[PDB]
Amino acid sequence: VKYCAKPVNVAKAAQARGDNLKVHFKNTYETADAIRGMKVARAQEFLKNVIIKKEIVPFRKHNGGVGRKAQCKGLNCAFGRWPVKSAQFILKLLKNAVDNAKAKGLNTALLTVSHIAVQEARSSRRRLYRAHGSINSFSSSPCHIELILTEKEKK
RNA sequence: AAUAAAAUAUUACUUUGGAUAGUUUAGUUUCCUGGGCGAUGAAGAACGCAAUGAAUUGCGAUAAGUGAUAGGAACAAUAAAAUGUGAAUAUCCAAAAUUUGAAUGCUUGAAAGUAUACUAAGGUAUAUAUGAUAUUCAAUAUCCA
């Protein structure tokens, strides 16, 4: 699976990617939307607070039946949740990209999460035995995640 | 009156999907030659056999192969051994061909078995109907001493 975009300067960027990750797309799509654009150090702090339910992930698009929370004030979204599994998966990719940046020799304190995209992946099927002799589909929703860190500079 | 979070629209890239294009060791039809099975056990079924095999292919206790005749230097995923004193490969040939199956000594269900005779174990023959010949008989059935 290729990357959605290429960095402007390959010498000052780092990349990490995960394919067919066993994590819900709709949860990880909203989590990756929250950390887009902030600094790597800030993003790691934000993702860690989400795990222990101290900062919200606003479910802006997929908000059907999602309950309201007190931390969703100011985000123009009345709904949010604390996806632990999806936050953990991104935390492992953010760490992996950072080690790639360090090998390149970049300055970790200057890196930001410039590009982060989530794509749908192939589903896996399972049986759900319903009434009157029926069987349904019990399908997973995996996803691919791509992460690109670039240094922030004045323009 | 204001927001663009959601929503909507266009393009580029990526993704799920497998359309489209290119292609064919596969099919369909017609035509030519034959139309060559079996008690000398067929077609079919079952089991087994490779140095590493489950299927498939080939084969039958001589097992992915034996002899003979052609054939001329390979096979390979990995080792071995053999090999111009003959490796692969080919066959209307020779030997060999497990349990069954018309199945045919008797039985057979998913049944393991078992009788007699001939030459302990092994191997042969013994089902039903039927033609010819040989031999042994039955019936005063017709004569007949």
Coordinates of C-alpha atoms (C1' of nucleotides) in Angstrom, one line a residue:
Chain A
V1 CA 0.0 0.0 0.0
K2 CA 1.5 3.3 -1.1
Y3 CA 1.3 6.6 0.7
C4 CA -1.4 9.2 0.1
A5 CA 1.1 12.0 -0.3
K6 CA 4.9 12.4 -0.5
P7 CA 6.8 14.8 1.7
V8 CA 8.2 18.1 0.2
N9 CA 11.7 17.3 1.3
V10 CA 12.5 13.7 1.9
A11 CA 15.6 14.7 3.8
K12 CA 13.6 16.3 6.6
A13 CA 10.7 13.8 7.0
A14 CA 10.0 10.4 8.6
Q15 CA 7.4 7.8 7.8
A16 CA 5.6 5.0 9.5
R17 CA 2.8 2.8 8.3
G18 CA 0.6 -0.1 9.3
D19 CA -1.5 -2.3 7.0
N20 CA -4.5 -4.4 7.9
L21 CA -4.5 -3.2 11.5
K22 CA -7.0 -5.0 13.6
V23 CA -8.7 -1.9 14.9
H24 CA -12.0 -0.2 14.1
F25 CA -11.9 2.2 11.2
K26 CA -14.5 4.6 12.5
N27 CA -12.8 4.9 15.9
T28 CA -9.3 5.3 14.4
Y29 CA -10.5 7.7 11.7
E30 CA -11.8 10.1 14.4
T31 CA -8.7 9.7 16.6
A32 CA -6.3 10.4 13.7
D33 CA -8.3 13.5 12.9
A34 CA -7.7 14.9 16.4
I35 CA -3.9 14.6 16.4
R36 CA -3.5 16.0 12.9
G37 CA -1.3 19.1 12.8
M38 CA 0.0 19.2 16.4
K39 CA 3.5 18.6 17.5
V40 CA 4.8 15.1 18.1
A41 CA 5.4 15.8 21.8
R42 CA 2.0 17.2 22.2
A43 CA 0.4 14.4 20.3
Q44 CA 1.9 11.8 22.5
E45 CA 0.7 13.6 25.6
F46 CA -2.8 13.9 24.0
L47 CA -3.0 10.2 23.0
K48 CA -1.9 9.2 26.5
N49 CA -4.6 11.3 28.1
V50 CA -7.2 9.7 25.9
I51 CA -6.3 6.3 27.2
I52 CA -6.9 7.2 30.8
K53 CA -10.0 9.2 29.8
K54 CA -8.7 12.7 30.5
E55 CA -9.1 14.2 27.0
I56 CA -11.9 13.6 24.5
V57 CA -11.8 12.5 20.9
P58 CA -14.7 14.4 19.2
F59 CA -16.6 12.0 16.9
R60 CA -17.5 14.6 14.4
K61 CA -18.8 12.5 11.5
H62 CA -19.7 9.1 12.9
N63 CA -21.8 10.3 15.8
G64 CA -24.9 8.1 15.6
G65 CA -25.9 7.2 19.1
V66 CA -22.6 8.6 20.5
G67 CA -23.2 10.0 24.0
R68 CA -22.4 13.6 25.0
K69 CA -19.5 14.4 27.3
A70 CA -18.4 17.4 29.4
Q71 CA -15.0 17.6 27.7
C72 CA -16.5 18.3 24.2
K73 CA -17.0 22.0 24.9
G74 CA -15.3 24.3 22.4
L75 CA -14.8 21.7 19.7
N76 CA -18.1 22.5 17.9
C77 CA -18.9 18.8 18.5
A78 CA -21.3 17.7 21.2
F79 CA -20.2 14.1 21.1
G80 CA -16.9 12.3 21.9
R81 CA -15.5 9.1 23.2
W82 CA -12.2 7.7 24.5
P83 CA -11.1 5.0 22.0
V84 CA -8.3 3.1 23.9
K85 CA -7.4 0.5 21.3
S86 CA -7.2 2.9 18.4
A87 CA -5.2 5.4 20.5
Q88 CA -2.7 2.6 21.5
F89 CA -2.2 1.6 17.8
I90 CA -1.3 5.2 16.8
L91 CA 1.0 5.5 19.8
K92 CA 3.0 2.5 18.5
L93 CA 3.2 4.1 15.0
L94 CA 4.1 7.5 16.4
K95 CA 6.9 5.9 18.3
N96 CA 8.1 4.0 15.3
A97 CA 8.2 7.1 13.1
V98 CA 10.1 9.0 15.7
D99 CA 12.9 6.3 15.8
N100 CA 13.0 6.6 12.0
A101 CA 13.4 10.4 12.4
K102 CA 16.2 9.9 14.9
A103 CA 18.1 7.6 12.6
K104 CA 17.8 10.2 9.9
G105 CA 19.2 12.7 12.4
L106 CA 16.3 15.1 12.6
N107 CA 15.4 17.2 15.7
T108 CA 12.6 15.4 17.5
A109 CA 11.5 18.6 19.3
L110 CA 10.7 20.3 16.0
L111 CA 8.6 17.5 14.4
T112 CA 4.9 17.8 13.8
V113 CA 2.3 15.3 12.6
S114 CA 1.8 17.0 9.2
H115 CA 0.1 14.1 7.3
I116 CA -1.9 11.3 8.9
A117 CA -4.5 9.3 6.9
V118 CA -6.6 6.2 7.5
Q119 CA -8.0 3.9 4.8
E120 CA -10.4 1.0 4.8
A121 CA -9.0 -2.5 4.5
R122 CA -10.3 -5.9 3.6
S123 CA -12.8 -7.3 6.1
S124 CA -12.9 -10.7 7.7
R125 CA -16.2 -12.6 8.0
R126 CA -17.8 -14.5 10.9
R127 CA -21.1 -16.2 11.5
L128 CA -23.9 -14.9 13.7
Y129 CA -26.7 -17.4 14.2
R130 CA -30.0 -15.7 14.1
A131 CA -33.6 -16.9 14.7
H132 CA -35.6 -19.0 12.3
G133 CA -32.5 -20.8 11.0
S134 CA -30.6 -17.8 9.7
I135 CA -26.9 -16.9 9.7
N136 CA -25.6 -13.4 9.3
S137 CA -22.2 -11.8 8.9
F138 CA -20.0 -10.7 11.8
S139 CA -17.4 -8.6 9.9
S140 CA -14.3 -6.8 11.2
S141 CA -13.4 -3.3 10.1
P142 CA -9.6 -3.1 9.9
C143 CA -7.7 -0.2 8.5
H144 CA -4.3 1.1 7.2
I145 CA -2.7 4.1 8.9
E146 CA 0.1 6.3 7.4
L147 CA 2.0 8.8 9.4
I148 CA 4.5 11.5 8.1
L149 CA 6.4 13.8 10.4
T150 CA 8.0 17.0 9.2
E151 CA 9.8 19.9 10.8
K152 CA 8.0 23.2 11.3
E153 CA 9.6 26.2 9.7
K154 CA 8.6 29.8 9.1
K155 CA 7.3 30.7 5.6
Chain B
rA1 C1' -27.4 38.2 12.2
rA2 C1' -23.0 34.8 12.4
rU3 C1' -20.4 29.7 12.3
rA4 C1' -18.2 26.4 8.8
rA5 C1' -17.8 21.2 12.9
rA6 C1' -21.2 18.1 10.0
rA7 C1' -23.2 18.4 4.5
rU8 C1' -22.5 19.2 -0.6
rA9 C1' -19.7 19.9 -5.4
rU10 C1' -14.9 19.6 -8.7
rU11 C1' -9.7 17.8 -9.4
rA12 C1' -5.1 15.1 -7.9
rC13 C1' -3.1 10.9 -4.9
rU14 C1' -4.1 6.5 -2.0
rU15 C1' -7.4 2.8 -0.6
rU16 C1' -11.9 -1.6 -1.0
rG17 C1' -13.5 -3.9 -5.9
rG18 C1' -12.1 -6.5 -10.0
rA19 C1' -14.5 -3.9 -14.9
rU20 C1' -11.8 -2.7 -19.3
rA21 C1' -7.6 -3.8 -22.7
rG22 C1' -3.8 -7.4 -24.3
rU23 C1' -3.5 -13.2 -24.1
rU24 C1' -4.6 -18.7 -24.2
rU25 C1' -1.6 -25.9 -22.8
rA26 C1' -9.5 -24.9 -22.7
rG27 C1' -14.0 -25.7 -25.1
rU28 C1' -17.9 -26.0 -29.6
rU29 C1' -19.1 -27.7 -34.5
rU30 C1' -18.1 -30.4 -39.1
rC31 C1' -15.3 -33.8 -41.6
rC32 C1' -11.7 -38.4 -42.4
rU33 C1' -9.9 -43.4 -40.4
rG34 C1' -11.3 -47.0 -37.1
rG35 C1' -15.3 -48.7 -34.0
rG36 C1' -9.8 -53.1 -31.9
rC37 C1' -13.7 -55.3 -24.1
rG38 C1' -15.0 -60.1 -21.1
rA39 C1' -14.8 -67.2 -17.5
rU40 C1' -7.3 -66.6 -20.8
rG41 C1' -12.0 -62.9 -15.5
rA42 C1' -13.9 -57.2 -18.4
rA43 C1' -16.0 -52.1 -17.2
rG44 C1' -16.6 -50.3 -12.1
rA45 C1' -15.2 -50.1 -6.9
rA46 C1' -11.6 -50.7 -2.7
rC47 C1' -6.9 -50.9 -0.4
rG48 C1' -1.7 -50.4 -1.0
rC49 C1' 3.1 -48.7 -3.3
rA50 C1' 7.9 -42.7 -3.9
rA51 C1' 14.2 -41.1 0.6
rU52 C1' 11.5 -36.9 2.3
rG53 C1' 3.5 -37.0 -0.4
rA54 C1' -2.1 -35.0 1.7
rA55 C1' -4.5 -34.7 -3.1
rU56 C1' -3.5 -35.8 -8.2
rU57 C1' -0.6 -38.9 -11.7
rG58 C1' 1.6 -43.9 -12.7
rC59 C1' 1.7 -48.7 -10.8
rG60 C1' 0.3 -53.8 -8.1
rA61 C1' 3.6 -57.5 -2.7
rU62 C1' 8.9 -57.6 -9.0
rA63 C1' 4.8 -51.1 -6.3
rA64 C1' 5.8 -43.1 -9.3
rG65 C1' 8.4 -49.3 -11.5
rU66 C1' 11.2 -55.0 -13.8
rG67 C1' 13.2 -57.4 -18.5
rA68 C1' 13.7 -56.8 -23.9
rU69 C1' 14.2 -53.5 -28.1
rA70 C1' 15.1 -48.5 -29.6
rG71 C1' 17.4 -44.2 -27.4
rG72 C1' 22.0 -41.4 -26.7
rA73 C1' 23.9 -37.7 -21.1
rA74 C1' 20.4 -36.3 -17.7
rC75 C1' 17.2 -35.2 -13.0
rA76 C1' 16.6 -31.4 -9.4
rA77 C1' 12.7 -28.6 -4.0
rU78 C1' 16.7 -30.9 -0.9
rA79 C1' 20.0 -34.5 -0.2
rA80 C1' 22.2 -39.7 -1.6
rA81 C1' 23.7 -43.6 -4.9
rA82 C1' 24.1 -45.0 -9.9
rU83 C1' 25.6 -43.6 -14.9
rG84 C1' 29.1 -43.9 -22.4
rU85 C1' 30.5 -51.4 -19.1
rG86 C1' 24.6 -46.9 -21.3
rA87 C1' 21.1 -41.6 -17.3
rA88 C1' 16.5 -39.7 -19.0
rU89 C1' 12.8 -41.1 -22.5
rA90 C1' 9.4 -44.5 -26.0
rU91 C1' 6.5 -49.1 -26.6
rC92 C1' 0.0 -53.0 -29.8
rC93 C1' 6.6 -57.0 -26.9
rA94 C1' 8.1 -60.5 -22.1
rA95 C1' 7.4 -61.5 -17.1
rA96 C1' 4.2 -59.9 -13.1
rA97 C1' -0.6 -58.4 -12.0
rU98 C1' -3.4 -57.3 -4.0
rU99 C1' -9.4 -57.5 -2.2
rU100 C1' -13.5 -57.4 -5.0
rG101 C1' -16.8 -56.8 -9.2
rA102 C1' -20.9 -61.1 -14.7
rA103 C1' -18.2 -63.1 -9.7
rU104 C1' -18.7 -68.5 -10.5
rG105 C1' -17.5 -74.0 -3.9
rC106 C1' -20.5 -71.9 0.7
rU107 C1' -21.3 -67.4 3.3
rU108 C1' -20.9 -62.0 3.1
rG109 C1' -23.6 -55.9 6.6
rA110 C1' -19.5 -52.3 7.8
rA111 C1' -18.2 -60.3 7.6
rA112 C1' -14.5 -61.6 10.9
rG113 C1' -14.7 -66.8 7.9
rU114 C1' -14.9 -71.6 6.0
rA115 C1' -15.8 -77.5 3.1
rU116 C1' -13.5 -81.3 0.0
rA117 C1' -9.9 -83.0 -3.6
rC118 C1' -4.9 -82.5 -5.9
rU119 C1' 0.1 -80.6 -5.7
rA120 C1' 2.1 -78.0 7.7
rA121 C1' 2.0 -73.0 4.9
rG122 C1' 1.2 -71.7 -0.4
rG123 C1' -1.2 -72.5 -5.2
rU124 C1' -5.1 -74.8 -8.3
rA125 C1' -10.4 -77.1 -9.2
rU126 C1' -15.5 -77.5 -7.5
rA127 C1' -22.0 -71.8 -9.1
rU128 C1' -26.4 -72.1 -13.0
rA129 C1' -27.9 -73.4 -17.8
rU130 C1' -25.9 -76.0 -21.9
rG131 C1' -23.3 -79.3 -27.0
rA132 C1' -20.3 -83.5 -28.1
rU133 C1' -17.8 -88.0 -26.3
rA134 C1' -16.8 -91.6 -22.4
rU135 C1' -18.4 -94.3 -18.1
rU136 C1' -21.9 -95.7 -14.2
rC137 C1' -26.9 -96.4 -13.4
rA138 C1' -32.9 -96.0 -13.3
rA139 C1' -37.7 -97.4 -15.3
rU140 C1' -40.8 -104.6 -17.7
rA141 C1' -41.2 -97.9 -21.1
rU142 C1' -41.2 -101.9 -25.9
rC143 C1' -39.8 -106.7 -26.9
rC144 C1' -38.0 -110.8 -24.7
rA145 C1' -35.1 -116.3 -22.8

